[PDB]
Amino acid sequence: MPNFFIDRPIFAWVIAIIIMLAGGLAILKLPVAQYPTIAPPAVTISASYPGADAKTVQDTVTQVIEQNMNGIDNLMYMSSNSDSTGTVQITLTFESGTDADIAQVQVQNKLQLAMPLLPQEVQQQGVSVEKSSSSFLMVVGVINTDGTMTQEDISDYVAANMKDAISRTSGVGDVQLFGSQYAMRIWMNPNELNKFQLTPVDVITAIKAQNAQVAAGQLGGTPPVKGQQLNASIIAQTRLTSTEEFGKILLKVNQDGSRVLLRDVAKIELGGENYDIIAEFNGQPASGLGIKLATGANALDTAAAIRAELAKMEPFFPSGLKIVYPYDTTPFVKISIHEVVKTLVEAIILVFLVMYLFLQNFRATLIPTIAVPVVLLGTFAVLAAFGFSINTLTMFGMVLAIGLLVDDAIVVVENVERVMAEEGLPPKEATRKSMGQIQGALVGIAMVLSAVFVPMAFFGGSTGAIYRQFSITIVSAMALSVLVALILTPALCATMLKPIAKGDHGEGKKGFFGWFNRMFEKSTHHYTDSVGGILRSTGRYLVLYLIIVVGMAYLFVRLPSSFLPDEDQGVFMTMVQLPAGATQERTQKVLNEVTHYYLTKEKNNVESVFAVNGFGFAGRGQNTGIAFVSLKDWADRPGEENKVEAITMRATRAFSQIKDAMVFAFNLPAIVELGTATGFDFELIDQAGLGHEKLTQARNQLLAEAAKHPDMLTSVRPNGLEDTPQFKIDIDQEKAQALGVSINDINTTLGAAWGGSYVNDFIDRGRVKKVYVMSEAKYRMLPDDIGDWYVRAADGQMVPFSAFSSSRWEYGSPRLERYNGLPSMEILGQAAPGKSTGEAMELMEQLASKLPTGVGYDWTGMSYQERLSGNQAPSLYAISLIVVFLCLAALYESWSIPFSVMLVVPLGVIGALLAATFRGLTNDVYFQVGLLTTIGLSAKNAILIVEFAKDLMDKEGKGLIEATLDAVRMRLRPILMTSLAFILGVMPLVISTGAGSGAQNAVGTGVMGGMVTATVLAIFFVPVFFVVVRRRFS
């Protein structure tokens, strides 16, 4: 193939043009997102049963739905929570590769058949099935700076005017309203209700009767009379529209002739559907829209479109309404992608500079400057073809593959240059000879790097999905680089390079270039002499190689493991957890202290604080809250002390002094779609119907036992809420019957007054809005207020609740958990420093085995993935190693020579490990992919060295030592210049400290160390391996 395209440079140029056009089309049409789909597909069912405790929701909703989640394909597991707020939340997790649309449709279809079995109130509120495996692209908050609009007003305005147009913006996949539309609130007064001889049941009945849509008919409708000429539709009673209309609702007319309206026994207003959650932006009332990106959409373009739509909206807003962006991580994505692109461009420029320094030829330097961009564009085309997107993983994989790309280009051009400078042949004949020398090596290298990189695509789980991005990117880049080195680079060398004299290698030049040429010639002579001396005493260096291998193993075992570096994305979170029974006001006060601290003690770093009172993480209630702190631009936060880690540490230290509250500040995970660390998530299952109390006792026993092992298990805690006091109303139905009070009336009165009851809809400004009846807040606060509520009897006489019911205080769970349809309790923990996750999981299994009868356990979350993909690596790499050996044996036509090449892995691995250890970095994904890239480059260099040596030994009569020395002399320059180019290209990643510096350092430090030690060691260890192998096996 190289000879074919040397006579046909225009055909090679046509192929290159096709590749570039395909790459450009892909670049214009590729999606862009921070990360790809990593989490396994999950479908989440949400239902609300207002006014209900955890047990009521669990027994009436959660269990009924869970007993019908059958016949759904590809389900890994299922979990559910039932909260004291009246909400059930069921998550069904499916294996990776499952079609999320099909999983969702199956789940909702099974729920549609389960729907008739649920309470009528749950059916009225609706059960929603969504995809919870994704996260918010953006959060657009709406605030009022005048105080004229409360939170409900802002929420209703956003719902009516903003949600539709934002949803219609291009690329927007989903919009969730941080709030709700208006609701007709009927705040009942029990005293007035008793005065006018009424109860909440009467109010609901009247509202339902006098606010409804009635089908009337049609004038002159078919079948008509034989002479009808007019046909018109008849309109009749329609839904109410104004608070005044609801106030005029008639409940009863008294005997004396007075009229009792709804306004007489209650206040009528436009409130919110729910009041559980209060959102504030820097202390001001706020609503919001959470925008999820559509599938296949460009995140940057979608964010820009959203901002443009909001800017268009701005003029029409009511005075004092403003738009803010509390959670804007798109700037982080933009700066990260820009840094990667800049790294690629600077790498190409550095390749040009190194080529000019070493070869002092302008056209030779131009040749790689054409070759590498063609390969990159082809790689973009290949990513687009297989439905990949431009994300952090793929872009960093491209950064890593730059080393192999530049190595291929440098190898081809430098070999042609050397053939010209030694044999004195013209460019065309020299290119023919060079490619005849190196083409088989290039093909074998392509196969070997395929063997090295493909196995990562076959890892399982979220980690496997992460690794597949790098695998596909690097494999495509390597294959395209080899194809270019076989097609275009020979043609460019044959057509562009100028002739060089037989004996000219830059000695006669003057100045810095002449000095550099003389110095490099002397260094080559010295290195050749040193290698020749080394080959006389190979045993000592074999012992040294064993020492290096032992040190490599030591460093590998002593290096901690991780998944992804934690990044300073310009935002972080602060959870507030108050003691059981804390009300909304106490949590609001604590959140106010947190906001004050962030806006005063960190005013130079924090831009805004979005405090949400009503739900934290792992729960939702009046005692929980979460604040999303946004930081200023990184340019305005210089130094380590002003980054997210330092700010979070200082904030946690400051908040530790807060009393009667656990306030904890922390940073986002690398991929927010997964909450993952070097820890375990553990489920304790009630396998025999023991009950909640026995399961709590078993959990306490397990927690104590785990705490008795501080050396292996750290911070083993429950992921749930402890039992809290509850107010039990024990109704004596015998008394109710004796007093002529229907228990249905008693229960309806209690629920409507204290829990709130949804009655029906009404049309406000052309939109359906719910009508809620609830007791006015004054009369449903304390237990004594129970005495303010009366119920009519069959005799017409009111009876108080104290007359037919007693009260007391008990203990109950505010949050009931189920796993795989059985009662469960979740425990989070992490292995102690120096201990692997597997050891902690084994110890937890052992401790669980000593638990009461009928208590089982399971692993869920990341622990499930660990338990599936536990031993898959070493097998996948034993297959890779075998395939590499087979490819090398095919290439060299020898069963023993492959070992001389294969013995080079530790040379780069040791350097990568040392660089990671000194810098303190962990054994994370980026480090592992960089390690594989270093191994690939080292193997490529060793393959070329051994190929040259064996070619000299076979095609010429040169001996083993002479051939080895000549081969290393020939290969020294390309190795050194490629290593220099790649090291200088990755310097910015190593030294970076700004946005995205975590991933940059993780990628760059290992690459730097591995490349440095590989270049230093291989150049005199590969000859030793080759000589030893040929002596022992010949």
Ligand X SMILES: CCCCCCCCCCCCCCCCCC(=O)OC[C@H](COP(=O)(O)OCCN)OC(=O)CCCCCCCCCCCCCCCCC
Ligand Y SMILES: NC1CCN(C[C@@H](O)COc2cccc(C(F)(F)F)c2)CC1
Residue 162 in the binding site for ligand Y (CB under 6 A): no
CB distance 974 to 415 below 8 Å: yes
Considering beta carbons, is residue 233 or 657 the nearer one to a second copy?
A: 233
Q: Which is nearer to ligand Y, 38 or 412 (CB)?
A: 38
Q: Which residues 6+ apart lie within 8 Å of 80 measured at CB?
A: 62, 65, 66, 88, 89, 90, 91, 817, 818
Q: How far is the CB of 362 from ligand Y (least distance, A)?
A: 54
Q: Which residues pair with 272 in a beta bridge?
A: 182
Among 77, 178, 655, 892, binds ligand Y (CB under 6 A): 178
Choose the contact partner of 755 out of ligand Y, a second copy, ligand X, none; CB within 5 to 8 A by kind.
a second copy
Asked if 132 interacts with ligand Y (CB under 6 A), we say no
SS3 272: strand
For tokens 């996948």, the residue is 876
Tokens coding 461:
């789980």
Nearer to a second copy, 234 or 308 (CB): 234
Nearer to ligand Y, 130 or 422 (CB): 130
Q: Which does 884 bind (CB under 5 to 8 A by kind): a second copy, ligand Y, ligand X, none?
A: ligand X
Q: Which string of DSSP letters, residue by residue, matches 390-433?
A: B-HHHHHHHHHHHHHHHHHHHHHHHHHHHHHHHH---HHHHHHH
**Interaction pattern, residues 908-927, with ligand X; x per rule: CB under 6 A:** ---------------x----
Cα 914 from Cα 551, distance rounded (Å) = 10
Q: Which does 743 bind (CB under 5 to 8 A by kind): ligand X, ligand Y, a second copy, none?
A: none
Instruction: Kindly state whether residue 182 participates in binding ligand Y, applying the rule CB under 6 A.
Output: no
For residues 56 and 88, is the Cβ–Cβ distance under 8 A?
no
**Helices 997-1032 and 392-423 sit at what angle, rounded to 10 degrees?**
40
Q: Is 557 in the site for ligand X (CB under 6 A)?
A: yes
Judged by CB under 6 A, the stretch of 69-77, 271-279, 493-501, 904-912 that binds ligand Y is 271-279
- Out of 561, 700, 715, 1034, name the contact with ligand X by CB under 6 A: 561
Cβ(93)–Cβ(42) below 8 Å:
yes
Span interacting with ligand Y, options 272-280, 526-534, 587-595, 981-989, rule CB under 6 A: 272-280
The smaller minimum CB distance to ligand Y, of residues 327 and 762, is found at: 327
CB 1016 to ligand X: min, Å: 18
- Indicate which of a second copy, ligand X, ligand Y, none lies near residue 396 (CB less than 5 to 8 Å, by partner kind): none
In whole angstroms, give the CA distance from residue 166 to residue 1000.
34
Where are the extended beta strands (E) located within 517-619? 571-577, 606-615
Shortest spacing between CB 137 and ligand Y, in angstroms: 11
Query: What burial letters (b/e) apply to 59-91, b meaning 16+ CB within 10 Å?
Result: ebbbbbbbeebeebebbbbbbbbbbbbbbbbbb
User: Which x/- pattern, by CB under 6 A, does the window 857-896 give for ligand X?
Assistant: ----------------xxx-xx-xx--x------------
**CA-CA distance, 816 to 800, in Å (whole number)?**
33
Task: Tell me the residue type at 546.
Answer: L
Instruction: Say which entry of ligand Y, ligand X, a second copy, none residue 234 contacts (CB below 5 to 8 A, set by partner kind).
Output: a second copy
Nearest of 228, 235, 180 to residue 213 by alpha carbon: 235
Report in angstroms how near the CB of residue 910 gets to ligand X at its nearest: 12
Nearest-angstrom CA–CA distance, 325 and 304: 13
Binding track, positions 924-943, relative to ligand X; x by CB under 6 A = ----x--x---x---x----
Among candidates 868, 992, 984, 862, which has minimal Cα distance to 926? 992
Which residues, numbered 806-845, are part of the site for ligand X (CB under 6 A)? none
Contact indicator for 410, 368 with CB cutoff of 8 Å? yes
By CB under 6 A, which span of 175-183, 467-475, 952-960, 999-1007 interacts with ligand Y?
Answer: 175-183
Tell which one of 274, 697, 726, 742 touches ligand Y (CB under 6 A): 274
Rank residues 51 and 756 by Cβ distance to a second copy and give the closer one: 756
**Which residues sit at the interface with a second copy, rule CB under 8 A?**
214-221, 223-225, 228, 230, 234, 236, 686, 689, 691, 751, 753-756, 765-767, 777-778, 780-783
Residue 333 or residue 354: which is nearer to ligand Y going by CB? 333
Residue from 25, 270, 559, 889 touching ligand X (CB under 6 A): that is 559
Cβ burial of 822 (10 Å; 0-12, 13-18, 19+) is middle
List the structure tokens of 157: 């305005």
ω before 718 within 30° of 0 (cis)? no
∠ CA 840-832-547, nearest 5°, is: 95
Count other C-beta atoms under 10 Å from residue 549's C-beta: 16
- Binding of ligand Y by 303 (CB under 6 A): no
Work out how close the CB of 548 gets to ligand X at its nearest, in angstroms, rounded to a whole number: 15
Q: Which does 557 bind (CB under 5 to 8 A by kind): ligand X, ligand Y, a second copy, none?
A: ligand X
Among 31, 40, 288, 720, binds ligand Y (CB under 6 A): 288
If the CB atoms of residues 310 and 793 are measured against a second copy, the closer one turns out to be 793
Of 128 and 254, the one with the shorter C-beta distance to a second copy is: 254
Position closest to ligand Y via CB: 178
Q: Packing angle between helix 837-849 and helix 692-707, nearest 10 degrees?
A: 130
Q: Which residues partner with 714 through β-bridges? A: 830
CA distance 608 to 271: 27
Regarding 905 and contact with ligand X (CB under 6 A), the answer is yes
Which residue number, 288 or 821, has a Cβ lying nearer to ligand Y?
288
Q: Within 13 A of 255's CA, how many CA atoms are on the CB side?
A: 1
For ligand Y, the closer CB: 5 or 325:
325
Distance set, CA 68 to CA 101, 108, 112, 114, 117 (Å): 19, 11, 10, 6, 10
Residue 555 binds ligand X, judged by CB under 6 A: no
- Structure-token pair, residue 870: 């536990």
**Total residues in contact with ligand Y, by rule CB under 6 A:** 12
C-alpha 37/C-alpha 96 separation (Å) is 10
Site string for ligand X, 467-506 (x = CB under 6 A): ----------------------------------------
- Select the binding partner of residue 235 from a second copy, ligand Y, ligand X, none (C-beta < 5 to 8 A, by kind): none
Q: Give the nearer residue to ligand Y in terms of CB position, either 143 or 612.
A: 612
Run of H or E including 941? helix 925-955
326 to 345, contacts with ligand Y by CB under 6 A? 327
Does the protein bind ligand Y through residue 179 (CB under 6 A)? yes
Q: Which is nearer to ligand X, 115 or 881 (CB)?
A: 881
Quick one: what does residue 753 bind among ligand X, a second copy, ligand Y, none, with the CB cut-off 5 to 8 Å set by partner type?
A: a second copy
CB atoms within 10 A of CB 650: 16
Three-class secondary structure assignment of 278-305: EEEECCEEEEEEEEEECCCCEHHHHHHH
Closest CA to 472 of 379, 536, 399: 379
The site partner of 959 among a second copy, ligand Y, ligand X, none (C-beta below 5 to 8 Å per kind) is: none
Whichever of 612 and 1017 has its CB closer to ligand Y, that residue is 612
Which residues in this chain contact ligand X in the complex, by CB under 6 A? 452, 557, 559, 561, 873-875, 877-878, 880-881, 884, 902, 905, 923, 928, 931, 935, 939
Which residues in this chain contact ligand Y in the complex, by CB under 6 A? 136, 139, 178-180, 274, 277, 279, 288, 327, 612, 628
